Write an enzyme that holds these catalytic residues in place. Structure first.
Site, PDB file in Angstrom:
ATOM      1  N   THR I   1       0.067   3.268   1.118  1.00 18.53           N
ATOM      2  CA  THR I   1      -0.080   2.738  -0.112  1.00 18.53           C
ATOM      3  C   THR I   1       0.850   3.300  -1.336  1.00 18.53           C
ATOM      4  O   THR I   1       0.985   4.328  -1.383  1.00 18.53           O
ATOM      5  CB  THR I   1      -1.344   2.621  -0.780  1.00 18.53           C
ATOM      6  OG1 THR I   1      -2.023   1.899   0.206  1.00 18.53           O
ATOM      7  CG2 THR I   1      -1.454   1.876  -2.138  1.00 18.53           C
ATOM      8  N   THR I   2       1.399   2.510  -2.065  1.00 18.63           N
ATOM      9  CA  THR I   2       2.147   2.910  -3.251  1.00 18.63           C
ATOM     10  C   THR I   2       2.160   2.089  -4.512  1.00 18.63           C
ATOM     11  O   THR I   2       2.589   0.983  -4.315  1.00 18.63           O
ATOM     12  CB  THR I   2       3.772   3.184  -3.143  1.00 18.63           C
ATOM     13  OG1 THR I   2       3.873   3.631  -1.700  1.00 18.63           O
ATOM     14  CG2 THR I   2       4.428   4.408  -3.893  1.00 18.63           C
ATOM     15  N   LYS I  33      -2.924  -5.867  -3.583  1.00 19.80           N
ATOM     16  CA  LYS I  33      -3.699  -4.767  -3.965  1.00 19.80           C
ATOM     17  C   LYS I  33      -3.789  -4.932  -5.156  1.00 19.80           C
ATOM     18  O   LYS I  33      -4.167  -3.880  -5.883  1.00 19.80           O
ATOM     19  CB  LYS I  33      -2.816  -3.425  -3.404  1.00 19.80           C
ATOM     20  CG  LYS I  33      -2.675  -3.360  -1.976  1.00 19.80           C
ATOM     21  CD  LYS I  33      -2.008  -2.043  -1.570  1.00 19.80           C
ATOM     22  CE  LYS I  33      -1.734  -2.055  -0.029  1.00 19.80           C
ATOM     23  NZ  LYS I  33      -0.835  -0.876   0.213  1.00 19.80           N
ATOM     24  N   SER I 130      -0.446   7.004  -1.076  1.00 18.91           N
ATOM     25  CA  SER I 130      -0.027   7.747  -0.073  1.00 18.91           C
ATOM     26  C   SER I 130       1.470   8.025  -0.226  1.00 18.91           C
ATOM     27  O   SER I 130       1.841   9.033   0.114  1.00 18.91           O
ATOM     28  CB  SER I 130      -0.492   7.449   1.122  1.00 18.91           C
ATOM     29  OG  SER I 130       0.521   7.648   2.253  1.00 18.91           O
ATOM     30  N   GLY I 131       2.215   7.284  -0.472  1.00 18.16           N
ATOM     31  CA  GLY I 131       3.626   7.302  -0.678  1.00 18.16           C
ATOM     32  C   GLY I 131       4.236   7.814  -2.171  1.00 18.16           C
ATOM     33  O   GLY I 131       5.298   7.877  -2.387  1.00 18.16           O
TER      34      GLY I 131
END
Lengths: 212, 197, 204, 201, 202, 197, 212, 212, 202, 197
Positions: I1-2, I33, I130-131
């Site tokens: 996810t970013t 999202k 996460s990214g």
């Protein structure tokens, strides 16, 4: 190796009439980071033998060095005998088993292709020493995502042509790109026939359709 | 647990042991020998893990016999105790250490009787009486109460009988029979067995 | 702990041209006494003693190897060893087993063979030598005898007052330790005499 | 710790040592391990000192309330039952106990042994602690029901003395009590060191 | 640690920070993480200090002997292969991520990565260390083919400043090294000369 | 323990405290931590004192041999190389931390050596358990190209700060001054603590 | 998460014919560093009762606050102030109430009794207590106890008549004992407080020790 | 909290004649990442009370909310009594202890400064419930790196002026920046005197000298 | 996810990727999202899908009731405070890192971070997921004060593309959302319209 | 381990048990009662962990007596066995489960004798003979060899004596005395004890 560090993913393989074609993507992952993006996971052993490996990349490079020296040394005195796909498959099985028996294995899942004597060869060699032959192969997540399509096709027709095999290979590479999180969108494609081994540069599966 | 005892007097070194050879909840034997004679005047008693006892005791005995055959006289109790301690300690940090608890009784032509204690860490003592096993806790205080430095053999067997009777009453193990023998001037002398049928 | 498995307590004190060493006699296993005449002090030289505490098997082994080496040395050289030289040799012996060591802490006390100058020292299990000028201790009641010696010690003491102080310290130190006691033996190394004594202690 | 007690012709005899230890360091050297519950009962202390003291104080309070309510004293069997019931509510939580109740009722001399586990058993000679096996070897070999008060005294003193001579967690002094028809009395508090010279040379 | 190297026509440029930590304490703040392997070859060190020092020494000795007996300057490829041999033989006991860069009369400037594992690869530019993960997008969006020496120096300095301002294990000063056919150039960018990037306000 | 060295204009100044402990109890009150290595090279030690002693004695013997064999003064770089090669060969199991320093034909040098074998050359450094306390003072007051008296003042103040804020240090301050000509040893240099009367 | 910490500190009480004495050091610690150099551990309870604590500082503070509250409740309900024995008994019950997550304190109550003489009571963390004549708890208690055995108990020495402890000799003994403890234990040694419980009232003094 | 997530570092504190000064840097670390870079770790309770906290930041914000509501509610009816530095120090000690006793602690190391009645106050409250007073304080790595300099100065002179105290504070903040790996180069400085609390904006220790 | 959000004068811009994994398998590749909390307030979700969905629902319900009874549009600060209350109360059982952004007539566009832990903060721009760690240097070197709507859209798209090309757990398409006083704007940047950055060759 | 046995005949249900009450390596008692009478014709035998046995057995007995007092007649052996199983099983998954091994003997005015087995998981059987303890392994095959469905009481005591003698010879525990009693028409009848002095 105890713990692999930089790993590759699935390698595919199909044998058609008068040749063998294999494929793999160009990416080295450092545990969910796409660190290196232009490495080659396919080797050419001699005029009738190709090789592609999964898993640890340093182990793949070591085995490249060893196998290359063997082929060189046997080709030196040039007496009229040369190694074969089957001889190389056996040698690799023996070396993998000898490493697993000392509890110090090489962490790869190699695939051997070949074409000698007028008929093709396609073999599989796991890190534990499991080895067999089949008209199709796939390692890693490919064993779940791409083998069903290859088997679905080879069930109907037991023999393909070069063009159909190549089409099938790219059609499977697309789905690997869709559903595998360690995969990349750049791959090589090797091919061995009666004239020798040919490798093709960075291809793309740009035939994507993201209708969200 | 197995039982061992020794009592040194003015010129005797009365000892004793049991005869049971249990394996599990069962009893395999009923008349087992826990005494290894090694010379005309030297006795060796052993307890602990199976294999270790006999393997360890036979090695000591063969070396003592070889010493005698080479040199024309026998080892003394002190020399035998020290040889035993050495050989036991050299195995402690090696790859295969023994788990034996020992008791060396003897008698020599100058110094008289001698009784040596030795646990499984190879620490060697000298005592007027000693004991190995779980029953040592129960029988160490009867000997403390009734022992005398000038006790005669008639009373020494009396005291040993009292100890064994206390064990019969208060232990949770079943140990019915015991060997008894004395080492005086004239070598080893087997004596009457004590049974509680 | 392993060095608390047989108990023990050793002590050395320095005076005016005199040394004194003392120990306890109890020999036992975890919670049960076996004998009360265990030897922990060894005569390495004419006026050179060593006291060992810890695991009793290692006490015996180290004493025997040390006697080996000292006999060989005094036969090869032709004279007696010095207190400082003996300390280095013991440290070397203990450091040879740096991995898998003996569980014993030694104490040395002697007189200089030509100047009659005292010497006390203690070493740790691995062979670290620390030389002092007042007193050394070792055992299970180390803190108790520390508390006693710091308060009772004086400089330039006679042999009489030295004996009184070391005895009065050992008694009250071991009276508060469970795994030490059964009597105390005291050696007094003067210039031309070596007096030995046994004190009356408690037997519980 | 070493405690003992044996019934005989003239009532019950109780003895103990007085040393308390935390590890290998002797904290205290004269504790009181006999717990005077009332003029007609007494318990003994082995295990956790705090548990012993606390629960026997609770028991003393309940015995007093029973007497006030029913106009008659409780008995040894009933008191032992009350104590065992009280400590059974905390099984598996880490209590450490083990005691002896002694007294006289309309049934004569009483001698009970209650534990932290939850058992209680009547007997004629008990012994508790870590010198129990050393005291047993002397009590078993000297005991006789046809014995009088001073022979009982001597046997008890000798048992405790040899126990503290061989055990590391026992020492100090030995305190002797005596339960008769008309309540208990205190007999002696000699110290093991002054006993040892008496019992040899 | 943040090490970096980029390649231009005639030579390469190296760079690194200067902080050596131990948990959350700064043991050394003027460390020099660039070491000379030969007259024209260097290496950047990251990971375990004792490991990287020992391996640099062994490789230095081997390469000096090899070149003195072959009677010519050595190759960046030879240096990289000796490094790879050692790092693969002791791959389970050592902790070293190296970057080898140098100049040889046969190919000029090259840059080789040897990550922990013992694998080798040639690259145009390479980043390594603990703080290098914070500047991947930046080197992806800033690099352009065929740069010159000054542009390379500026590129490296800016990337290293951005890494140091976010990584907690990195900091101190920047040390640069441009290697060419003439020789070696060493400079320090300390204090107020660190290229400041705008911090968001309010 | 607290050890600290500095590089002034014409040499080195080292320092240490003199308290050895064993757990939480003071064993020695005059433990010496500045060792001889060569007539111009010295060393300080922290960590496992037995390891410090063994390593420094072995290195001193090797340097005496090397100097006898060449015929010239030894070098701080040679001592540093020998030490770090040994410590790496033992994989960190010899727990010694060192502040080697000297003066040779090249000038004053000062190194740090760690149990795993990593080294670092610097102008001032500290080690031990009051190392952060001494490093604060050094950061606050160090000036390059200083003079002898002020170097001594600075290092004594750093050692005192480590002594008064660390439970594992105390009782005295040693100083060792190395220049191109002299070799000054001051064992009872400062006495900040006196026992109550 | 560990809910306990070890903070050092030594306490020492001594009972006499007419008097009573509690003493302590003033250092607070955690690990290898020093928090403060002036922190007492002796707390006046009533006009003839002092209590010294050691161990964990948070529990020490909580415990002294609880005791101060309960003294006031008792006085408001019974129209008179408590006594030393009642205080010791109540402290026993308070310490037992927390027996499965206990106070990590070592208490030492001191005071005068109704008959006008010293009364030292020693406690353990869970409640067990006994009336002594002297006592020492803390980090140097194993170092202090044999000295008091030799001096106040008069043990192990014959050829002496053992006359009682005057206040002068008691205070001198306390000072010398603490000096020697400071020279060998790493947890004591900033300063020394001395509370003196007597008929007239509580007094206090101070003496300096040697710093770190 | 079981596990802290976003944490701050050392807080300093000095009391001079007629006031108290404290300081702290503006940084939130997410386990060796400098994630947030402009947060304020200093609070102003009322006209004579300041507060700075270390450790978990969500816990610090919760305690800010609670303490602010208390001050508001007591100031509502305005009867002529107001909370004091000591009352707030005690309240905080009690709340921390009540949280540690349920095995659910607040993970901070607060510092309280104040100036009421004509003399200053400076207190320390740990997460376990340890609490004391001193003429200087420091939390975290500051307890090792900055307390020695403060003690070195206050040993010679027991009283400073406002200017000297501020100089000392910044001289220590510089060394914290040199040697702490979770530290930042931007800090605030609060000050309480007879006129009230004053906070100063983002300062810098640009007095660095990196001669490598 | 970013996920990402940046602030301009009049409103904010939001962004996110579309991949939901399970280990090394892509379970959903068209995930959304960005969720609407109210008519003018949104939130970006990262972490555990079930947690973030449940918390978004509870907050939506509470905020709707609050605003209907107070008879006016709600505030971004109110939404952020409800999120913070829930995330701090269940801080040991939930796994959610949220970004709240919206528009209110009293302050316009604001951006609030609520990382896992339950702490609140206002920011100008925020990245999470996460990214997001791969683009810290890029957002540090690219942001400049006082941008406009199109510049913000371009900035966000480029940052998200750089994150997706390196993070193995991120990918798919980009979804953007610029919120203003007029309404909400939703677009998708798929396939060939992803802004390609140059990859090093040879 | 403790020992239990039961033998059902044509009109009798002869049972037995031991008398030892060991705690550790020591023996605390010598005449302990492991039988709980609950009615004029119902016996209950118990083994297992201390506290559990008596706490569990007294509860059963008080409930049986209360049933009789309420209803004017006594429970039957079947009803008592089932009540016992229920109460034991309801505690199995609760916070405090008992660890008792049981044996219920009885006799009723219609069905005759009855012997019930019950392990600690609360599984209830009915058998012509049973046994609990470690000695069950040794004495289950003597009963198999010599039992008869029409055996008389004279021979039943014979067979029980043979079993106990086998235990005396082959067990490693010391169990000297055993209780013996019979439940026929006329209620419970204590019998002569069997001792192996």
């Amino acid at each position: 190796t105890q713990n692999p560090m930089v790993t590759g993913t699935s390698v595919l393989g199909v044998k058609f009439d008068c040749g063998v074609v294999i494929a793999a993507d160009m990416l080295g992952s450092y545990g969910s980071l796409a660190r290196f993006r232009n490495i080659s996971r396919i080797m050419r052993v001699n005029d009738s033998t190709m090789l592609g490996a999964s898993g640890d990349y340093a182990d793949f490079q070591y085995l490249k060095q060893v196998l290359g020296q063997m082929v060189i040394d046997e080709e030196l005195f040039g007496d009229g005998h040369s190694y074969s796909p089957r001889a190389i498959h056996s040698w690799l099985t023996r070396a993998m088993y000898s490493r697993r028996s000392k509890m110090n294995p090489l962490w790869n899942t190699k695939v051997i292709g070949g074409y000698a004597g007028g008929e093709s060869f396609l073999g599989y060699v796991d890190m534990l020493g499991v080895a067999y032959e089949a008209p199709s192969l796939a390692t890693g997540y490919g064993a779940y995502l791409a083998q069903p399509l290859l088997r679905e096709v080879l069930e109907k027709q037991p023999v393909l042509s070069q063009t159909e095999a190549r089409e099938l290979v790219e059609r499977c590479m697309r789905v690997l790109y869709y559903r595998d999180a360690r995969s990349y969108n750049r791959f090589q494609v090797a091919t061995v026939t009666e004239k020798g081994v040919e490798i093709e540069g960075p291809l793309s599966a740009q035939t994507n359709w993201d209708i969200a | 647990m197995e039982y061992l005892i020794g009592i040194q007097g003015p010129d005797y070194v009365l000892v004793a042991s049991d005869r049971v050879a249990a394996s599990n909840i069962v009893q395999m034997k009923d008349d087992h020998d826990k005494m290894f004679k090694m010379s005309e005047k030297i006795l060796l008693l052993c307890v602990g893990e199976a294999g270790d006892t006999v393997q360890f005791a036979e090695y000591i005995q063969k070396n003592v016999q070889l010493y005698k055959m080479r040199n024309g006289y026998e080892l003394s109790p002190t020399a035998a105790a020290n040889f035993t301690r050495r050989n036991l300690a050299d195995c402690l940090r090696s790859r295969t250490p023994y788990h034996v608890n020992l008791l060396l009784a003897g008698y020599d032509e100058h110094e008289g009787p001698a009784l040596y204690y030795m646990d499984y860490l190879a620490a060697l003592a000298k005592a007027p009486f000693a004991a190995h096993g779980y029953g040592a806790f129960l029988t160490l205080s009867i000997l403390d109460r009734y022992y005398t430095p000038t006790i005669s053999r008639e009373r020494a067997v009396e005291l040993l009988r009292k100890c064994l009777e206390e064990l019969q009453k208060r232990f949770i193990l079943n140990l019915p029979t015991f060997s008894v023998r004395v080492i005086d001037k004239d070598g080893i002398h087997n004596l009457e067995n004590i049974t509680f049928t | 702990s392993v060095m608390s498995y047989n108990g023990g307590a050793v002590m050395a004190m320095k005076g005016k041209n005199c040394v004194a060493i003392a120990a306890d006699r109890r020999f036992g296993i975890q919670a049960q006494m076996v004998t009360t005449d265990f030897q922990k002090i060894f005569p390495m030289g004419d006026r050179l003693y060593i006291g060992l505490a810890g695991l009793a098997t290692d006490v015996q082994t180290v004493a025997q190897r040390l006697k080996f080496r000292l006999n060989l040395y005094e036969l090869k050289e032709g004279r007696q060893i010095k207190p400082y030289t003996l300390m280095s040799m013991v440290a070397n012996l203990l450091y040879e087993k740096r991995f898998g060591p003996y569980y014993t802490e030694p104490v040395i006390a002697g007189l200089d063979p030509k100047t009659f100058k005292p010497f006390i020292c203690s070493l740790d299990l691995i062979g670290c030598p620390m030389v002092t000028d007042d007193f050394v201790v070792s055992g299970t009641c180390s803190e108790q005898m520390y508390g006693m010696c710091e308060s009772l010690w004086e400089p330039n003491m006679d042999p009489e007052h030295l004996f009184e102080t070391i005895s009065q310290a050992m008694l009250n130190a071991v009276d508060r330790d469970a795994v030490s006691g059964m009597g105390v033996i005291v050696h007094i190394i003067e210039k031309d005499k070596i007096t030995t004594r046994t004190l009356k202690a408690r037997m519980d | 710790t070493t405690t003992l007690a044996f019934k005989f012709q003239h009532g019950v005899i109780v003895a103990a040592d007085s040393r308390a230890t935390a590890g290998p360091y002797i904290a205290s050297q004269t504790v009181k391990k006999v717990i005077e519950i009332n003029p007609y009962l007494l318990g003994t202390m082995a295990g956790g000192a705090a548990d012993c003291s606390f629960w026997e104080r609770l028991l003393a309070r309940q015995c007093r309330i029973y007497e006030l309510r029913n106009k008659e004293r409780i008995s040894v069997a009933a008191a032992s039952k009350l104590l065992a019931n009280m400590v059974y509510q905390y099984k598996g939580m880490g209590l450490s106990m083990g005691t002896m109740i002694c007294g006289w009722d309309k049934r004569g001399p009483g001698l009970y042994y209650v534990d932290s586990e939850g058992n209680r058993i009547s007997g004629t000679a008990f012994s508790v602690g870590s010198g129990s096996v050393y005291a047993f070897g002397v009590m078993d070999r000297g005991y006789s029901y046809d014995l009088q008060v001073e022979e009982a005294y001597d046997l008890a003193r000798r048992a405790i003395y040899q126990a503290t001579y061989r055990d590391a967690y026992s020492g100090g002094a030995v305190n002797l009590y005596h339960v008769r028809e008309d309540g208990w009395i205190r007999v002696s508090s000699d110290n093991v060191a002054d006993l040892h010279d008496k019992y040899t040379s | 640690t943040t090490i970096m190297a980029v390649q231009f026509d005639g030579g390469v440029v190296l760079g690194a920070d200067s902080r050596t930590t131990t948990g959350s304490y700064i043991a050394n703040r003027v460390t020099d993480k660039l070491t000379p392997i030969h007259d024209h070859i260097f290496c950047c060190r990251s990971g375990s200090a004792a490991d990287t020092q020992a391996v640099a020494d062994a490789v230095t000795y081997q390469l000096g002997f090899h070149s003195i007996e072959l009677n010519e300057p050595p190759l960046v490829h030879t240096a990289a292969s000796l490094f790879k041999e050692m790092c693969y033989r002791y791959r389970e006991d050592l902790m070293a991520g190296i970057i080898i860069a140098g100049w040889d009369p046969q190919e000029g400037g090259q840059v080789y990565s040897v990550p922990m594992g013992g694998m080798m690869v040639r690259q145009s530019f390479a980043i390594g260390g603990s703080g290098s993960s914070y500047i991947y997008g930046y080197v992806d969006a800033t690099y352009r083919e065929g740069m010159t020496k000054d542009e390379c120096l500026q590129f490296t300095a800016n990337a290293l400043a951005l890494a140091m301002e976010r990584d907690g294990s990195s900091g101190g000063v920047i040390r640069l090294a441009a290697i060419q056919q003439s020789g070696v150039e060493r400079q320090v960018l300390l204090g107020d000369q660190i290229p400041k990037v705008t911090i968001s306000t309010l | 323990t607290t050890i600290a060295g500095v590089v002034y204009k014409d040499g080195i100044v080292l320092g240490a405290d003199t308290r050895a402990t064993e757990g939480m109890v003071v064993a020695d009150k005059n433990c010496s931590k500045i060792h001889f290595i060569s007539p111009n090279i010295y060393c300080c030690g922290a960590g496992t004192a037995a390891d410090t002693d063994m390593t420094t004695q072995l290195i001193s013997s090797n340097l005496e041999l090397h100097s006898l064999t060449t015929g010239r003064l030894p070098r701080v770089v040679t001592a540093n190389r020998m030490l770090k090669q040994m410590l790496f060969r033992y994989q960190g199991y010899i727990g010694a931390a060192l502040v080697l320093g000297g003066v040779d034909v090249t000038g004053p040098h000062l190194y740090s050596i760690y149990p795993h074998g990593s080294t670092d050359k610097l102008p001032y450094v500290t080690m031990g358990s009051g190392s952060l306390a001494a490093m604060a003072v050094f950061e606050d007051k160090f000036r390059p190209d200083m003079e002898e008296e002020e170097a001594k003042k600075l290092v004594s103040e750093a050692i005192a700060a480590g002594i008064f804020n660390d439970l594992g240090s105390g009782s005295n301050i040693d100083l060792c001054v190395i220049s191109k000509s002299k070799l000054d040893f001051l064992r009872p240099y400062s006495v900040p603590n006196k026992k109550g009367t | 998460f560990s809910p306990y910490a070890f903070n050092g500190g030594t306490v020492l009480a001594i009972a006499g014919e007419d008097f009573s004495i509690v003493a302590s050091d003033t250092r607070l610690s955690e690990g290898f560093s020093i928090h403060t150099r002036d922190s007492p551990k002796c707390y006046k309870l009533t006009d003839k009762t002092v209590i010294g604590c050691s161990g964990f500082h948070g529990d020490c503070l909580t415990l002294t606050k609880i005791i101060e509250a309960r003294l006031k409740m008792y006085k408001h309900s019974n129209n008179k102030a408590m006594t030393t024995g009642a205080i010791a008994a109540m402290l026993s019950t308070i310490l037992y109430s927390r027996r499965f997550f206990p106070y990590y304190v070592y208490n030492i109550i001191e005071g005068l009794d109704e008959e006008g003489k010293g009364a030292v009571y020693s406690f353990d963390p869970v409640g067990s207590y006994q009336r002594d004549s002297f006592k020492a708890g803390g980090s140097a208690s194993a170092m202090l106890q044999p000295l008091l055995d030799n001096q106040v108990g008069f043990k192990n020495m014959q050829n002496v008549e053992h006359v009682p402890l005057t206040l002068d000799r008691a205070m001198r003994l306390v000072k010398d004992v603490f000096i020697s403890a400071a020279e060998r234990d790493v947890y004591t040694g900033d300063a020394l407080r001395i509370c003196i419980v007597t008929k007239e009232g509580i007094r206090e003094e101070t003496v300096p020790l040697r710093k770190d």
